[PDB]
Nucleic acid binder design. Sequence first.
DNA 1: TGCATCCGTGAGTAGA
DNA 2: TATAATGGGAGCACGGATGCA
Lengths: 39, 94, 1112, 263, 221, 83, 104, 52, 14
Amino acid sequence: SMARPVSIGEAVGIVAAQSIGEPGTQLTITQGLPRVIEL
Amino acid sequence: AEPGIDKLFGMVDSKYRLTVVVAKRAQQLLRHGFKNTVLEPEERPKMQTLEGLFDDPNAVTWAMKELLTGRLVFGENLVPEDRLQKEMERLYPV
Amino acid sequence: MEIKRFGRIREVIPLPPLTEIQVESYRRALQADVPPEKRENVGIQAAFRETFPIEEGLVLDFLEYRLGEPPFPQDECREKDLTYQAPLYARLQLIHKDTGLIKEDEVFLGHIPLMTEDGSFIINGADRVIVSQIHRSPGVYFTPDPARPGRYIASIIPLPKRGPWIDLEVEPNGVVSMKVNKRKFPLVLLLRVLGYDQETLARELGAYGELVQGLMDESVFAMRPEEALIRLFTLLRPGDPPKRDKAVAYVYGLIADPRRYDLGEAGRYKAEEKLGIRLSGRTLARFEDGEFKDEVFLPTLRYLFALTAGVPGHEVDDIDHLGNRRIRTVGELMTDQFRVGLARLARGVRERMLMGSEDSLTPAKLVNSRPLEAAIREFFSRSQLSQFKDETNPLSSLRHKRRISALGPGGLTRERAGFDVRDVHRTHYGRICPVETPEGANIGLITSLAAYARVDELGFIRTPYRRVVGGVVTDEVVYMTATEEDRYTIAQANTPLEGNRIAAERVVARRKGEPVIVSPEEVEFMDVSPKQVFSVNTNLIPFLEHDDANRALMGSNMQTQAVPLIRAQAPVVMTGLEERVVRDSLAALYAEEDGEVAKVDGNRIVVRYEDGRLVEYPLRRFYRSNQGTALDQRPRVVVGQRVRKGDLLADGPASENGFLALGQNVLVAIMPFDGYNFEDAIVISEELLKRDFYTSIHIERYEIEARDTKLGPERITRDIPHLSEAALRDLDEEGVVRIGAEVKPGDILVGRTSFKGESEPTPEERLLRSIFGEKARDVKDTSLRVPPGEGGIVVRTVRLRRGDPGVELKPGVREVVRVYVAQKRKLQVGDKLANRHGNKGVVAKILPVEDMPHLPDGTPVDVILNPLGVPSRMNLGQILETHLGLAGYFLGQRYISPIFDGAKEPEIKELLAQAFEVYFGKRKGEGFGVDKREVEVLRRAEKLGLVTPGKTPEEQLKELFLQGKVVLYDGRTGEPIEGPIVVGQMFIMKLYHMVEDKMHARSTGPYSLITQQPLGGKAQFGGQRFGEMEVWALEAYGAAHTLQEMLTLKSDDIEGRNAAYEAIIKGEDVPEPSVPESFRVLVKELQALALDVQTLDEKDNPVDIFEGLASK
Amino acid sequence: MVQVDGGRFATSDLNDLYRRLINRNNRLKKLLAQGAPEIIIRNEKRMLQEAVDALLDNGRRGAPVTNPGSDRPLRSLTDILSGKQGRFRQNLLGKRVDYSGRSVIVVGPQLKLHQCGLPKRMALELFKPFLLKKMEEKGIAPNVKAARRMLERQRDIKDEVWDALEEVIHGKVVLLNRAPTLHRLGIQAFQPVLVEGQSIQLHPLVCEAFNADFDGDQMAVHVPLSSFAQAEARIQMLSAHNLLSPASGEPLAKPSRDIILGL
Amino acid sequence: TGRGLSFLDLIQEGNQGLIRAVEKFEYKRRFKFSTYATWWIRQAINRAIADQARTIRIPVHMVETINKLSRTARQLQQELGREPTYEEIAEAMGPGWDAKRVEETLKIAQEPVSLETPIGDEKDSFYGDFIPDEHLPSPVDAATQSLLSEELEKALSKLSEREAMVLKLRKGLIDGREHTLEEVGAFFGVTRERIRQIENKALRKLKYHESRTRKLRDFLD
Amino acid sequence: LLMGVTKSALSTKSWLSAASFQNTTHVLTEAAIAGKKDELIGLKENVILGRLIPAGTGSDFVRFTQVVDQKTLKAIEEARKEA
Amino acid sequence: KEVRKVRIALASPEKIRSWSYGEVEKPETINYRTLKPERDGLFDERIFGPIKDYECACGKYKRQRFEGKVCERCGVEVTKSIVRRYRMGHIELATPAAHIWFVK
Amino acid sequence: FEVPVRSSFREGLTVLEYFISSHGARKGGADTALRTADSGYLTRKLVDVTHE
Amino acid sequence: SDPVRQYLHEIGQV
DNA sequence: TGCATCCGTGAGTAGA
DNA sequence: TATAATGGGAGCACGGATGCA
Ligand SMILES: [Mg+2]
Ligand SMILES: [Mg+2]
Ligand SMILES: [Mg+2]
Ligand SMILES: [Zn+2]
């Protein structure tokens, strides 16, 4: 977000989960969301 | 955008440390009634009322401007908290 | 003004009554208009025929029943919070089997709710609607085994709660298995029970190779049906002693007895048609001659083996095929709940038969009506398919009754619904609307009945088609279900016709839904109209063929959200269906026969009909609906006017001259304006507010009760302790605010005092009273006031009191006051507007007339729409409506363009030319030439390639006007827009969602009992929910103190919130937050689970968060 | 066991479960004292066990305990703790809060990136205690109570309290939030600008981050109280302070729609 | 079954009845045991149904009264063809019964409702979420009491200490208790009649200070 | 050992964090048997107790930082020097 | 006394008894007329606590001067009503009962 | 389907073609409706596993 | 599985 | 070792 | 407190984990 080294104390777990989950409704052998959840 | 936010982020190793410093400093300014301010009378943040310019009631803005000046010293394990509070209560009674 | 009609398609039949799906159903259920001897076995009568006779006097039998007349009119029911209903009496006879004596009587069974002419009900004073329920029709079905290719499953399905589903299949081990109540057992056993012998089964089923060999078990044929029945009984019911009498009492009850197991009549017909047999009763098996006799089983098994073997003439069933799905209407649901409630009467009857005096008994002493009453009441008040009737406007009510749901009792549960049931089936053509259906989790589950679609007594949905013989289309109209439809080849209604004969060599038709091109000789039928394909709402969208289905859906659904306006006007471009909607919804008032109006007033219209009888029609005036809108009737006629039969007298809400008005026609320009139309937002002219466009009357009802309490009675009085005259100003002598008074938040409507709960006044508190030289008043102020963001003029008052005639209050309540307050709402910023094409948005900005883009003649536009909303949405209907609206603006005429048949481009070009002559030629005759600005715009247009170079400015301006684009001047500058803008007349409605109702804020307020967190909702003045995801947001930001503040000081921390409030009002900083209360609730609730939860320190020493309060 | 508005009573099902348990336990004790046969005592003990079962976790084993004339399974302690409506998810990991509000959003084109239009009435309610203290600092009210009673009736509201409210919120920020919150940009900090009308004004550039258009979308407002909370909101959560997606690193606040069209 | 008690509960209470029957039975009368037992079993079952079926306990005789009222009203609605009023019930109940007694009896016969009763169409919300807590003081009330004590301490020091402290001594600001004339007298070394006349005197002078600054208006509500 | 996000989330050392996810009965039972102690290391645990989350400003890294005047610093320096 | 940890374990019958301020003998809630907690009932104030702050059931001691004082008449401790949230009761079973969480 | 829709929204659709498109439209809608739920569940799982 | 059935069975033993 | 059983999951806010 | 009466009545979907054949 800041284009600079991450500040200590930033919680990157929540940020990662949100970053992965956010475009979950945009996702359209397995493809898309079922594949993601499969992995 | 907050004025000089890039510089303020530049002053610290972590943005959250900047937040802590600003918060604590604002608390110190509220407790001592802005009597401990390092700002000159012409450097004082102003608010526009119906009457005229008064002092900016917001302690956070004050703290950020003070921090911008460079007259403040921040860090860990500088002084003991008790000694600090006693000296501060002596220099600026409430 | 003149109304120009388009389209070459002539509808052979009008729309059938749209409320029939309610009215006809419930009427057929009750049959009060038919004499008791003529009453059919369908409906409530069935409940009387199934439950009776009651035996083991020794016998109580049903002779006849009757419905009385309503003890109160509908209006009085709505007023007094009663239910509109008729009494139910049952005439029965008590027959003794020894003594030949017969005791005749008729007993009161309680009251049953009555439907209105509009097809709704009134329950406890509130209008309600019973929603039709689609489900899987009973019968015999055959589906391919998903796990085992080449094998099939045969399902025998009865009606819901009419007894168990039964599944027959061929298992890999080679035998034939049957499943009842999740128990698999070899079918051969039951086959032996029904009396079948190895010989009969061998000769019957032996045709198919080695299918019957798995049906061969020597141990089963080695025993009489008795032993097979007993073994079957011990299989189905372990733990119960296998007695013959109880075995029969079980197996016959389950698989035979009609009062338990009942297939549908349509299910019976399904079985007959599919299997090719005839059912004696509606039951699979029947008890006769002291033995069991089969009906359904052998044919079902035969069909199963035939299909499995691959024998031609057998095919699998589509479970979602509309032939296999039927509709349970209001009458049917109410009927079944009546059967359920009446079956409970039997228990009471037999109970009172077994004990007491067998000598002295009457049907009055035997019958306790309470369960039956409690059944029907449970169905109307608390059920799923019984919904609060939605009337924002007549169309919403009309559509609410035409809803088709797959949800509710006996139906599907959500999240258990796959794509299959939510899909649009090929048989939904003409029956269920492919367009109209909710967005989100309910999609496909809630659908709408088609316009021309009708539902038979069987429950199936059928749609009209015209017969075609040898290329000649007749006027004969046949209603067909899906299965019937699959038989023929049906041509489209747009097929070219010279007279009644088909003029096209290759005609577009369909066989079982599959699109195919054919010859006129092969055409067996034709569609009545495109209208039949879509619902009522969807049929109100002009140029529907130019809109994407997804936006058409929104346009369809949002019309029911349209608020009635005082100035409301019918659309410039209509579909022609607008009057029927107003008629069927019973909003407007019409004349009975040919006559002459005697009297026209605000409150009533007196008509004198030719026969001489004087008929006075009272008019509803300023009535509040369920949704809070305004419903009143405005007279459309004058004294001495000569009217015919079925002519308009008064106009109902949201109606202009008998036409449906959901909004107003405004002048729109399509062009971005200063980012105020950014992302679907809408800019409007202040002029709309000046002339009172999009202004609506809204009435809210505020109720209060004064009851009897153990400390003392609560009273409604003008005396309110510790209040100035300024607050008591508009209150009358009794304490109720005078009607016509203006109330704002904080004002008192009904003054009420209540005796204080016994309290120990703090030394400070009771000192203070003496400080001002006063004594503590015996009561405190409970008075009803006006909640924040609400208010208006009080238009009505109602006071119910006990000790006075005609009124009986619920126990303990002394009096009840109702205050009806109305307000006139102007269109403001944040109110939601929408068109019929799915384009919707809130009003972002209201510009003064000088800031609006305007025509060269000085005419400003009403509304500015953003073109960016068009392309991704793919609804071009609004564009064409805007062009035709532009033509109709200058031509001063309206239009009717039905769906799929209507105005095409060249016609609109002609109309735009004709309008252009008026728009320009006027100016030229007024002695005005072409403007410089117009020349510049025309140059830019030449560069755009919108006009042909070299032509005169007038010719180019016409070439632009034909495209629906005009020169537009910026009101802020006077400089023209650099290019021609689309300007026209569009029909826009103000939706029920308004910023005035939805705005809320809370500093502090009421907290919950157990959790001590702020309550929910604006109505309760609660707080906003900060959920898991929001906490995740704060965590991701890394704001610790903000989050902690949300978790403690702002919600459940008592000491914390108190100290924070006190710190803020004193000007200090908020203190350190302490332990939240919900966590203490957690600890104590975990202690109730016998788990010891200990908060410790770094030394593992116990830390008490209860501060010694929980420790002895 | 509480008395509602109508004078009637509302109670928790745990009271019924406890009642069953106590009744069956007492009956058991009496049966033991009276020397009942083994069968009776056995059945009674079974019933007791199933009563403790129903109390602790209902529906776990056998048919769930329901009230007379109802199909609704009574709510046990396990049901209270577990689930989406359970104590944890509902009342612990999330809560309803004070100093919060909501309303319909409307495009803010005149706003700076760090600003949001805030309706006067809403701000008056949200900042109410601060407004009371400010009213006491000036001569609008002699004390806090008088000021509160003054604000209770809308007709008693004059312009001086608005002018004081302006000085109250000065420099402070509020939090705007839209559901569903998919990522941390579903909540952003803005400087409130008091506006007429009941609608919240939202800056065009944050709409993408909020996934907000105006079809009638609504948003919630929250007020950070402490100087720490305000410091966090202003430094960390400010809209203008986060211009890039924490996911892709690309700008999440960028020209779109009409802007791109004009440029 | 269906009286508010489970089948097994009825069976167990009936078992108690059976025990009573066994202990009280006499074979001398040549009666089958079922005859004598049935009475005690029905008695026990009925006592159980009357005792345990209500969340808020009501005495058995009152239960009999309520059931009687129910049957009476049911007969009345049975014959009249409509739900009877309190007056008609008062009539069919005989002497001593008026409309008010019927109303109060029906009011006292009301069973409480569950807080977990479903509100919407889903499991989303419950009835108990819409009920405020009237018991615990809101922060506004707490600050009200606090500021009340503040201003009362502000205006009470305006004059001579001992008489104001005698006023507080009567109203229990000091000790939180009202002291009798002889006691509140014996406190500071005085006795009897004077004390009351001082309180009034205080309350007279108390009418001075505040009336000049007028700080106490709003707290009087 | 590889396991999915669900099993991983349910296998975490913190019982407060695990029980608030799903399978609450299982988690609570095993934890109660083991006499498990939650160290409140993560977020959810502290959120439940309404404590300050160990992240952002709540981090043990940045929350102990002090802010002081040059004058006050000099004063402390005096007090240290003379004593 | 900051909380650095949260421990969870089983509760012995003795622990459960040391939690309880009394046994609930009667399956009763409140009186049908006076609408007050029944003696030895689920809502009984002699066990869980006073309904009104610093006041007993009979009304003998109505003030804060008595704290920790149990009335000899109505047997109610004089203290803050908030303890009604914090105070456990208990039920002594005739025969032990298995906690279903450790069974099913 | 063997037969496509030759018509644009400019030209306008036959009721047949429209009804043909309704299938795809509905399918897409339901797809979205379920997908939101699945995605949300996934997200909650991720948050729960990564929160510390 | 069913307490009532179990008790009825235990009743039929005598 | 694989088939089969029980058990436990299934977005958020608003309103009602 | 006393004829005799003696066994009830309702009612989708995919995963991990364990149990069993
Ligand atoms: Mg959008
Ligand atoms: Mg939107
Ligand atoms: Mg009488
Ligand atoms: Zn006492």
